[PDB]
Amino acid sequence: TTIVALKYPGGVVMAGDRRSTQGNMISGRDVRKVYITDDYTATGIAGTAAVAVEFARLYAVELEHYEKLEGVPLTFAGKINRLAIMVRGNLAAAMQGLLALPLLAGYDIHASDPQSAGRIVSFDAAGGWNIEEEGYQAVGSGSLFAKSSMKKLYSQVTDGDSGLRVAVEALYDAADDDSATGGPDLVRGIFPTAVIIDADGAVDVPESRIAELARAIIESRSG
Amino acid sequence: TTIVALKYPGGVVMAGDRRSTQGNMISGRDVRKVYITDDYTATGIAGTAAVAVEFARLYAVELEHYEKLEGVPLTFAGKINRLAIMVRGNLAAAMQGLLALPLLAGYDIHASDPQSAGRIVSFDAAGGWNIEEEGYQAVGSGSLFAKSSMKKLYSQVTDGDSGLRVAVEALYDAADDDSATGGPDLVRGIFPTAVIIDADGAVDVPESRIAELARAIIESRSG
Amino acid sequence: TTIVALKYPGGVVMAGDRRSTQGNMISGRDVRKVYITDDYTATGIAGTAAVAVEFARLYAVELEHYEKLEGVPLTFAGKINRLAIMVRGNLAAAMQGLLALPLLAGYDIHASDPQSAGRIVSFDAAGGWNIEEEGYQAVGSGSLFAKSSMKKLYSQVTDGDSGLRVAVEALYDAADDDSATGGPDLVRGIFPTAVIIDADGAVDVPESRIAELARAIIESRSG
Amino acid sequence: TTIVALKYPGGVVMAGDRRSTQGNMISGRDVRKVYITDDYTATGIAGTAAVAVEFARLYAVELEHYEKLEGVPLTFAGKINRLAIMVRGNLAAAMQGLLALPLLAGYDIHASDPQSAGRIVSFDAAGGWNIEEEGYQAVGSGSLFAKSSMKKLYSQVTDGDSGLRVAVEALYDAADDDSATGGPDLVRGIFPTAVIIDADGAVDVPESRIAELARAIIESRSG
Amino acid sequence: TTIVALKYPGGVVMAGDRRSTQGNMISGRDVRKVYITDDYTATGIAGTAAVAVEFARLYAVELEHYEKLEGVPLTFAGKINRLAIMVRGNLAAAMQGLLALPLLAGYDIHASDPQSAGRIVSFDAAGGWNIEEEGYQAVGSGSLFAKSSMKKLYSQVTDGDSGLRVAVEALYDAADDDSATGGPDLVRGIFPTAVIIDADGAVDVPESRIAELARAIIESRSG
Amino acid sequence: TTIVALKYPGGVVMAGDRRSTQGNMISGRDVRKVYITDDYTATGIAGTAAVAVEFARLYAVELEHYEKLEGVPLTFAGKINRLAIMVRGNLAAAMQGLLALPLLAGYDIHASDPQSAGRIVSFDAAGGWNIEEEGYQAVGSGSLFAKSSMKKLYSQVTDGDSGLRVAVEALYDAADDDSATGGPDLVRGIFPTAVIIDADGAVDVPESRIAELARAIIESRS
Amino acid sequence: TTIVALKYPGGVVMAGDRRSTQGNMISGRDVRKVYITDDYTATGIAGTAAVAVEFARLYAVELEHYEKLEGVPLTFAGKINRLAIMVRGNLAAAMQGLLALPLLAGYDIHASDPQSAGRIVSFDAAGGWNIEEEGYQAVGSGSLFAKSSMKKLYSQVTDGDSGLRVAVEALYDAADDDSATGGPDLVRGIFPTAVIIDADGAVDVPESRIAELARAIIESRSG
Ligand SMILES: CCN(CC)C(=O)C[C@H](NC(=O)CCc1ccccc1)C(=O)N[C@@H](C)C(=O)NCc1cccc2ccccc12
Ligand SMILES: CCN(CC)C(=O)C[C@H](NC(=O)CCc1ccccc1)C(=O)N[C@@H](C)C(=O)NCc1cccc2ccccc12
Ligand SMILES: CCN(CC)C(=O)C[C@H](NC(=O)CCc1ccccc1)C(=O)N[C@@H](C)C(=O)NCc1cccc2ccccc12
Ligand SMILES: CCN(CC)C(=O)C[C@H](NC(=O)CCc1ccccc1)C(=O)N[C@@H](C)C(=O)NCc1cccc2ccccc12
Ligand SMILES: CCN(CC)C(=O)C[C@H](NC(=O)CCc1ccccc1)C(=O)N[C@@H](C)C(=O)NCc1cccc2ccccc12
Ligand SMILES: CCN(CC)C(=O)C[C@H](NC(=O)CCc1ccccc1)C(=O)N[C@@H](C)C(=O)NCc1cccc2ccccc12
Ligand SMILES: CCN(CC)C(=O)C[C@H](NC(=O)CCc1ccccc1)C(=O)N[C@@H](C)C(=O)NCc1cccc2ccccc12
Structure with a gap:
């Protein structure tokens, strides 16, 4: 698995193999590892499939739950805290092998400067989190090559x-040096998943754009 | 790893990722797992690289050693026994993690029928061997898929x-379903190695032939 | 054990040894491993017999329970989720040897396209699930041969x-290469079980048609 | 694995799956587990292939070695003793998992009565042996069904x-109730191997005769 | 221990050593291992005596309890399910040595065809059950000889x-090859117990009949 | 530790922290992990210090031993084989924790094409080796970042x-992401060591040039 | 990690890498390990990030909780006790690897002598605490070198x-001899964090001040 996320002027992007x-x-060849968890948040997760999907689903439900009870969405800091608490809750099972780590990408609508309002937060198995001030981050077995x-x-x-091109290319390098990360399948037409987030919200990047970028990178490394 | 061998009318083929x-x-992206061990036999090995290479090198030396000492090469059965004894000798190290299994493909010059003179022999970690009378065989983490x-x-x-085509395609399916087996890298121009053996001896198949077969299988699965 | 499922135009088919x-x-020579769990769903299970049958029975009861309580059946996604939760609940006992995995085949009455309304979902020991978009899937000790x-x-x-013929042939190959999967018993007249699901519902395929297909496969492979 | 042996008036027969x-x-579908060890003796071995084949090979060499050194073959009792000593010698490796048990069938040329000159001897992992005066014996995972x-x-x-018919049918039942023993493959034309021993020596029973008997048994149990 | 049960046209028989x-x-030389558990069902159990007898006793009590509470006996499937749940309930104690497996024989009065209404159900230590469609079944240390x-x-x-005779003879062979199963004691006048079940109910076969069959078998095996 | 080696037209370069x-x-702040083992080969080693220095020393001794006994140096393939056999010889102690892996850089004087005669060979704990046809390779705890x-x-x-610059920069990134790899110490004036090998042989790269290259990379990223 | 704290005339200073x-x-390169826990106390923690941040946050919450409930802040002894208890509460998780130790720096508003009202308290994994009467203290992997x-x-x-200069220089030496402690990064402009506390309260030392001191130290150690 490799999940990458990077900040660009005015937004954030996340992509996964x-x-x-x-x-x-x-x-599996078609799995989705990057999920839009709310209008301004996407989560990409590496690890045990059951636990990862449970994280994404339960987290989205929790956030929108708070929003419907209290009429207002959580602050971004609050969103981070709840995800961390969820991970820490899974620690016991994670030590027996059901381990999954998330990577959080969001757009903080209450940030002062809308052009650097993108946020990228990484977590460890104990729920410790870090907001990445250097602009990019990755998680998974290929995360070192991607970073x-x-x-x-x-x-x-x-x-x-x-x-978006840098994100896709980082996933390409990851898949190039990590057998647990999948590169573009030109025969089956399966490419990484991407989510883009700016002031207008979080949107799935259409497959065709990623495919064009993939073929561009491949050509670039051939001739 | 995936190593394949199959009998064809008048010869035998072995290929490896x-x-x-x-x-x-x-x-590694360019390694060689199939070695011509003598004029009429090739050996492909799966497992720890160091032990596999030592197997191929030492075995080739043993065969040519006997051939120079006694003025005549071993009967094929004798070659079988020697590889088996070599494998059995390694059993202790194999238990401690230095495990490697070979697949032997040969052309028996003393066979009655020059068309069924192909031979395919498989081995286990304790040296037990079986001569494959069904025409094909494979070994390695993708061997089930190739078979x-x-x-x-x-x-x-x-x-x-x-x-040769069926062989390369079996390697294609193997790499398709096993991450430890490498498919054709069309970007770098790296393809499986193949050895063909008939009455005229054992020759390395040039990489361009395999490249043609690989591209053929690909655009065969594309439409 | 081997259970196979594949999508065909307008429906889905599932068969088990x-x-x-x-x-x-x-x-046992006559065991049934594929169960009709509701009017539009069948479940086939591999693993400990006690756990497998218990899964099938409890699952059918749960689905129809909801259907009578709420006056409407679960959406297909809901059926998937409930099966996954059931599997996850057993993880503890499975780790001690009471392991069973199900394979889900259904027809989604709410799908837009009646041709592709077939659904095949696979599960792992932790409840993680995958909806197979490539058309076929299998589970059990022979599942790789069948796939x-x-x-x-x-x-x-x-x-x-x-x-149905491709399904039966897949089971034939599984039983051919797996000693834990049973092939067709022409002496006793015992053949795999099959369930077909289309817009008209889920019905058991009559043993006679499976017999016909089995003999066709055998005869094509003997000459 | 299942090996059977039985005494008949004037000879003895041994067969293996x-x-x-x-x-x-x-x-493997074609392995040979019954070996002619000398002009009047056959050995069938069950267990790990490497050790079994090694037993057969080494034993035959020992018997003929004594015969050429001393100008006369061993008494049958001597043959028994040497095989026993070999098994006891392997006991340590067997306790580490490299276990193999042989079954000995012979014709005692020095017996007074040519009808009861057949001999069937069974062995345990410590080399203890028993000459079976009840006429038949079997060894392997299916040996209790065969017996x-x-x-x-x-x-x-x-x-x-x-x-020979009774032997092949006993192997048939063994394969019927034990998955580790293979029955007759009418599709591939592969049947058990048999050796028959009488006053004229030990000869391999031709494939065609076993094939006939196999189909006789099959059509006998179907109708 | 050996318990056998087989279906005959119009009924079922069970016998135990x-x-x-x-x-x-x-x-012990006179113990009873086969119990009539209700008007149309008998249970024979192998394993730890305390656990076996408690199974039989509590099971009969449960059946008659339901009958008196609800004015109607359980369907046969229900009887199966309760026995299975009882075995599964004992599983934990079983894996510490208090193991007992039952074999269930009944006559289904609600079956459509009264001449094939006999039923034989076998159980494993986890409560998994199978209704035996092949006519006979056995349990205990001699069960494989008997089968x-x-x-x-x-x-x-x-x-x-x-x-009945076939059953008693099967017990004879079991006791012949298993030292933990007791054969007929002609000196003490102690013979297996048997239960016969048809449309008129379940009755104990009198000792005289079983002794008669025992002597018949012995003289058949002597001359 | 991080050792890098890369091929350039007509030669090879190796550098280590x-x-x-x-x-x-x-x-330690000044250790040397890249050694000239003979006129046309250098070896850099990662792992337990004792095992590494013993590898370098015994290897150089073995090569010169064959050269003096037989009047001719080993073929490059032979050099590869001897280093590999040495590693395999250490495998048992390596399993007790005394693990060291070498990285071999050489110039093959018997090569067909003098431009592409550079050679880079990597080894694992079992003596397995691979000749890198892709031009660069690294070993040590920062070798992923450097690669x-x-x-x-x-x-x-x-x-x-x-x-040489590319090598030094790869070491810079390695030290940037790995605490066990040391970057340039501008306070103490300690920089990576480098060896260059071409047809004229293998020579130590002088400290001054590496210091310059390091300061150029630093100023470039600031 | 290294946290240092030292008393100066009329106040206390604490700094962390x-x-x-x-x-x-x-x-991470910009993490914060020293937290202002109330107007007159700062805490710096070494160990696993999740536990450390949880300690700081929960502690600050607890202190201000008491202050709002009872209208008056805790005595310094009370603060020390609460932190000590919090650690002892974590002892169990600490035994399993989630270990974190805090270092407490405060200004006791109720102290008799204001110029020596600074307080430095260290803790062990069981909650044992010591008030440092020698003026300075450190915690973390570099604490020996800094002390x-x-x-x-x-x-x-x-x-x-x-x-402040002495604190920063101790951190410099710690990072000099410990790879787990980070020194000043002049390329990225990241320097230790510092908190100063006197009668006017606890304030964060501005980054520019620490950068000045850092560059001064570097120039002093180079020339
Ligand atoms: C989707 C479920 N399926 C098919 C039935 C799988 O095969 C998944 C696979 N399960 C397993 O490997 C089983 C783990 C397990 C649990 C309990 C006891 C023993 C073993 C997995 O998680 N693999 C991990 C290593 C992985 O690939 N993780 C990548 C990943 C990340 C985020 C979302 C994902 C969604 C679906 C699939 C993968 C996803
Ligand atoms: C070429 C050697 N290199 C680079 C230095 C490798 O990384 C190979 C890798 N070593 C290891 O995995 C080392 C593991 C080990 C052994 C002993 C003690 C501690 C650890 C390997 O064998 N991998 C196995 C799984 C493999 O890929 N095996 C495939 C294979 C088969 C036949 C010939 C081969 C020749 C070269 C490389 C691979 C070959
Ligand atoms: C039906 C019960 N019988 C007859 C007494 C069996 O022999 C089944 C066999 N039990 C066992 O092997 C017992 C395992 C056990 C239980 C508790 C403690 C220790 C060990 C089994 O499940 N084997 C597994 C490997 C298997 O065959 N699995 C195939 C299978 C799949 C789905 C539904 C099935 C229903 C009936 C039988 C098999 C079924
Ligand atoms: C013939 C060699 N091949 C193909 C590579 C096999 O797969 C045989 C298989 N080896 C193994 O299963 C390997 C055992 C082993 C050794 C060391 C460490 C771990 C495991 C086997 O003996 N199986 C047993 C269960 C068996 O089938 N035994 C039956 C048997 C009896 C007499 C002569 C035989 C000759 C060939 C094959 C089988 C023979
Ligand atoms: C209760 C009858 N008596 C006399 C006191 C026995 O000694 C029987 C014997 N107890 C024991 O062996 C005691 C084992 C034990 C108990 C607790 C903790 C540790 C070990 C037994 O179970 N034998 C087993 C192997 C057996 O024979 N089982 C066969 C059997 C089946 C159904 C009903 C039975 C009723 C009476 C006797 C046997 C019965
Ligand atoms: C000998 C240098 N000194 C001073 C006495 C050290 O303390 C080095 C340090 N010893 C140790 O870590 C002791 C290992 C040991 C052995 C047996 C039982 C318990 C522990 C080390 O090897 N560290 C490794 C991790 C390392 O730094 N390796 C880097 C390295 C690579 C190539 C050549 C080198 C030459 C000198 C120093 C380092 C070298
Ligand atoms: C900030 C979170 N991230 C980003 C993903 C990390 O990588 C932190 C790292 N996690 C881990 O090392 C994970 C340990 C673990 C937990 C459960 C199961 C298995 C293993 C860490 O704490 N390292 C320790 C050695 C450390 O550096 N500790 C220093 C430290 C002290 C006080 C406050 C801190 C706040 C943030 C980061 C570090 C802090």
Whole structure:
């Protein structure tokens, strides 16, 4: 698994690979690991499938629950705190093998500067979290390759589109060096999933855009 | 890892993928797992790289050693016994993690029928061996997938070319369902290695032939 | 054990073998592993017999329970979720040996496209689920052999009859390569169980048609 | 695995199934487990393949070695003792999992009565042996099914041919109730191996005769 | 211990031996292991004596309890389910050595065809149950000898008498090959217990009839 | 520890950091992990210090031993084999925790094409080796960061100088993301060590040039 | 991690590094480890991030909770006790790896002598506490090095500013000899965090001040 997220001027982007394994065996090619959890938040998760989907689902339900009870959505800090509490709650099972870590990408509507209002928060198995002030982050078995790639490509991020390309390319490098992360399947037409978040909300990036970027990167490395 | 071997009228074919892993990380893209061990036999090995290479090298040396000492090469059965004894010798280390299993493909010059002179022999970690009378065999983490693919495609084997095609395609399905097995890397131009053996001896199949077969299988599954 | 399920135009088909073992001993020849759980759903289960049957029975009761309490059946997603939760509840006992995995086949009455309204969902020991968009799926000790067979035979599926034949042939390959999966017993007249589900509901396929198909497969493979 | 042996008037017969497994997976369909160890003796071995084949090979070499050194073959008692000593020698490795048990069938050329000159000897993991004066014996995972079948069918043994039928049928029942023992494959034309031993020596029973008897049994149990 | 049960046209028969052991020592010669649990059902149990007798006693009590509470006896399926739940309830204690498995024989008065209304249900330590469609079944340390005997004698079962004799003979073979199963004691006048169940109900077969069959079997095996 | 090696037209370069640790404590700031083992080969080692230095020392001794006994140096393949056999020999102690892996960089004088005669060989704890046809390789706790950095910077390698810079920068990224890899110490004046190998042989890169390259990278990222 | 605290005439200062690790990998460069817990107390914590942040936040909440409930802040002894209790409460999780130790720096408004009203309290994993009468203290993986540095530099503490310089220099030495403690990053402009506390309350030391002191130290150690 590899989940990546990076800040661009005025928003944030998150993308994830599509491969699911049981040990060395490929058990899935079309899985979705990045979920829109509310109008301004997306979550990408690495780890045990059952636990990850449970995280995404339960979290979305909790956030909208607070919003309907109290007539107002949680502050972003509050959203972070609830996700962390959820992870910490799973710690016991995580130590026996049902481990899953989330990566949080959001747009803080109450932030002062709407152009840096994007937020990227990483978590550990104990619920400890860090808000990434360096602009990008990744989680999963390919997260080191992806981060080290973005370290070189991040200066090319000037808007949402260029940031989306850097995200897809980081996933490409991850899948290149990690067998548990899936690269683009040009035969089946399966590409990474992406979510883009700005002041207008969180939207799924359409498949075709990611496919165009994928073919562009592949060509770039061939000739 | 996936190593395949199949009999065709008048010869035998063996092919292997090019991937090396350490856990989930890709540690090699160009490795060689199929070795010509003598003029009429090739060995492909799965398992720990160091032990596999030592097997191939030491075995080739042993065969040519006997051939120079006694002026005549071993009967094929004798070659079988030697590889088996070598494998059994390693059992202790195999238990401690240095496990490697070979697959032997040969052409028996002393066979009655020059068309069924192909031989495929499989081994286990304790040296037990079986001569495959069903025409094909595979070993490695993707070997089950390769075998099940060849079970369906084997009726199409009529000459060296079709047999080589079925072999490469079995490797394709294997890499398709196993992350530890590498498929064709069309970007870097890295394809499986193949060895073909007939009455004229054992030759390495050039990479361009396999490249053509790979592209053929791909656009065969694309439409 | 092997259970297979595949989508065909306008419906879904699921079939399961009939063998029960205790270690190497054959303890059953006539076992039924595919259960109609409601008017539009069948469940086939692999694993400990007690746990498998208990799953099927309790699941059917739960679905129809909701249907009578609320005057309407669950949406298909709801059926998936309840099965997953049931599996997850058993995780503790499964870790001690009472392990069972189900495979879900259903027809979604609320789907827009009647042709693709078939649904096949697979589960793992932790309740994680996947809706298979590639058309077929299997579970059990022979599941990899069956999946790899259907990978080659699936293009021949155009109706319920051809799909049922591909299913039975997949079970044949599974039982061919798996000692824990039982093939057709022509001496005793015992054949796999099959369930077909379309807009008209879920019905048991009559044993005679499965017999016909089994003999067709056998005869095509002997000459 | 199942090996059977029975005494008939004027000779002895031994037969073995053809299946090789790794756990539940069928890893071989054609293996030979019954070996002619000298002009008047055959050995069939059950257990791990490496140790079984090693037993057969080494034993045959030992017997013929004594015969060429001393110009005369061992008494049957001597053959028994040497096989026993070999098993006891392997006891340590067997206790570590490399376990194999043989079954000995011979014709004692020095017996007074040529009708009761048949000999059937069974062994345990510590080398203890028993000469079976009840006429039949079996070894392997299906040996209890085979023994109990012969307990009912033994009265039908009147010559080498009927004894061969009873042997093949006992193997049939063994394969019927034990998944680790393989029955006759009428699709592939693979049947158990048999060796018959009388005053003229030990000879392999031709494939076609066993095939005939197998179909006789099958059509006998169907109608 | 050995308990056998078989279906005959219009009824069912169950019989059990009389031996009780502590390790190798004979601790009982006249014990009863087959109990009439209700007007149309008998249960025979193998395993720890305290647990077996408690199963039989509590089970009969449960059946008659339901009958008196609801004015009607349980359907046979219900009887199965309650016995299964009882076994599963004992599972934990079973894995500490207090293990007992039952074998259920009944006559389903609500079946459509009165001549095939016989029912034989076997259970495992986890409560999994199977209704035996092949006509006979056994449980205990001698159960495999008994089953393999009935496999040969079952074609002779045409009525209650032939079914009874076949059962008693199966117990004879079980006791012949199993030291934990007791054969007929002609010195003490102690023979297996048997229950016959048809449309008129379940009755204990008198000792005289069983002794008669025992002597018949012995002289059949002597001459 | 992080050791990097990369091929450039007509040669090869290898560089390694200077940090030695015991757990979290820094126990050394100036160590040398890249050694010239013969006129045309250098070896850099990661792992337990004792095993690493013993590897380098015994390896150099073995090569020169064969050269003096037989009047000719080992073929490059032979050098590979001897280093591999040494690692395999250490496997047992390595399993007790005394693990060290080498990285081999050489110039093959018997090579067909003098431009592409550079060679880079990596090893695992069992003596398995791989000759890298992709131009660069690294070993140690920061080797993932260094490899992934070179994956982006390698297209900039056109001569010995650009290759040396790329190596030093990969070490910079490695030390940036790995606490067990030491970056340039501008206060104490301690920089990575580097060895360059071409047809004229293997020579130590002088400290001054690495210091310059480091300060250029630093000023470039600030 | 390294947290230092030292008393100066009329106040106290506490400072902490900014590095976060996962084993050898640096997972953070800007983390905050020193928290102002109330107007007159700051807490810095070393260990697992989740537990440390939870300690700081929960502690601040508890103190202000008492202040609002009872209209008056806790005595310093009370503050110390509550923190001590909080740690002892975490002891169980600490035994399993979720270990965190705090270091408390405060200004006792009720102290008799205002120029020595600074207080420094250290804690162990069981909640045992000690008030440091020697003027300075440290906690974390670099605390030995920082303490031994302050042991030499403490005579230079004459006002708040000299105390701040000595604190920063101790952190510098700690990061110099410990890889788990991060020094000043002049490229990214990230420096230790510092809090100063006197009678006017607890205030965060501005980053520019610490940067000045850091660069001064570096220049002093280079030339
Ligand atoms: C979707 C469920 N299926 C098919 C039935 C799988 O095969 C998933 C696989 N389960 C397992 O490997 C089973 C783990 C387990 C639990 C209890 C006892 C023993 C073993 C998995 O989680 N693999 C992990 C390593 C993984 O791939 N994780 C990647 C991942 C991340 C976020 C969302 C995802 C959604 C679906 C699938 C994967 C997802
Ligand atoms: C070429 C060697 N390199 C680079 C230095 C590797 O990373 C290989 C990798 N080592 C390891 O996994 C080392 C594990 C180990 C052994 C002993 C003690 C501690 C740890 C491997 O064998 N992987 C296995 C799973 C594998 O990929 N096996 C496939 C394979 C088969 C036949 C010939 C091969 C030759 C080269 C590489 C692979 C080969
Ligand atoms: C039906 C009960 N009988 C006859 C007495 C069996 O022999 C079944 C067998 N029990 C066992 O092997 C007992 C395992 C156990 C339980 C408790 C403590 C320790 C060990 C089994 O489940 N085997 C597994 C491997 C299996 O065959 N699984 C296949 C299977 C799948 C779905 C529904 C099924 C229903 C009936 C039989 C089999 C079924
Ligand atoms: C023939 C070699 N092959 C193919 C590579 C096999 O798969 C055989 C299989 N080895 C194994 O299962 C490997 C055992 C092992 C050794 C060390 C560490 C871990 C595991 C086997 O013996 N199976 C047993 C259950 C068996 O089938 N035994 C039956 C048997 C009896 C007499 C002669 C035989 C000759 C060939 C095959 C089987 C024979
Ligand atoms: C109760 C009858 N007596 C005399 C006091 C026995 O010694 C029987 C013997 N007890 C024991 O072996 C005691 C074992 C034990 C109990 C608790 C903790 C640790 C160990 C037994 O169960 N034997 C087993 C192997 C057995 O024979 N089982 C067969 C059996 C089946 C159904 C009903 C039965 C009724 C009486 C005797 C046997 C019965
Ligand atoms: C010898 C240098 N000194 C000073 C006495 C050290 O403390 C080094 C440190 N010893 C240790 O960690 C002791 C290992 C040990 C062995 C047996 C039982 C318990 C513990 C080390 O090797 N650290 C490893 C992690 C390391 O830093 N390795 C880096 C390294 C690589 C290549 C050549 C090197 C040469 C000198 C120093 C380091 C070198
Ligand atoms: C901030 C959260 N992140 C980002 C994903 C981290 O990587 C932190 C890292 N987690 C871990 O090391 C995870 C440990 C764990 C927990 C449960 C099961 C298995 C393993 C850590 O605490 N490292 C320790 C060694 C550390 O650096 N501790 C320093 C420290 C002290 C006070 C406040 C802090 C706040 C944030 C970060 C660090 C802080």
